[PDB]
Amino acid sequence: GSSGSSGAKHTLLRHEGIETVSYATQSLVVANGGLGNGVSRNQLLPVLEKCGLVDALLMPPNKPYSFARYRTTEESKRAYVTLNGKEVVDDLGQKITLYLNFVEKVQWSGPSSG
Numbered sequence: 001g002s003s004g005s006s007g008a009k010h011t012l013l014r015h016e017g018i019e020t021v022s023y024a025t026q027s028l029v030v031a032n033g034g035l036g037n038g039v040s041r042n043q044l045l046p047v048l049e050k051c052g053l054v055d056a057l058l059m060p061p062n063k064p065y066s067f068a069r070y071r072t073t074e075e076s077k078r079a080y081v082t083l084n085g086k087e088v089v090d091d092l093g094q095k096i097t098l099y100l101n102f103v104e105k106v107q108w109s110g111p112s113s114g
Helices: 012-016 041-051 073-082
Strands: 027-031 054-058 066-070 087-089 095-097 099-103
Touching: 027 073, 041 054, 041 066, 041 073, 041 087, 066 073, 073 099
Parallel strands: none
Antiparallel strands: 027 066, 027 099, 054 066, 087 095
8 A cells, every 4th residue: 555644755764664654753764864874873873852852863774764762752752853954063064954754753773661
């Protein structure tokens, strides 16, 4: 069934195989970003903080996409509707357009208790 609503802007996501929900989820996925996109943690976190509290920011190596974890849903959404589509200067010095998608679950680097 080829169906999808409120999806990303590019397919880069579809390929990798990143599944994103439609509703709001404390967790989020930064598109067109990640270290691979010359985007350091101290360069991306700053934007994830100004919007809302950043509990945990997962940044996989050699991955143009990353995952963030806010403290309260409200925050996540605020950044999802704000950060998403917003541009940001990368290491190279070029403004890149990142897209944040709502994710219910994410391959975090921690043992899920329970």
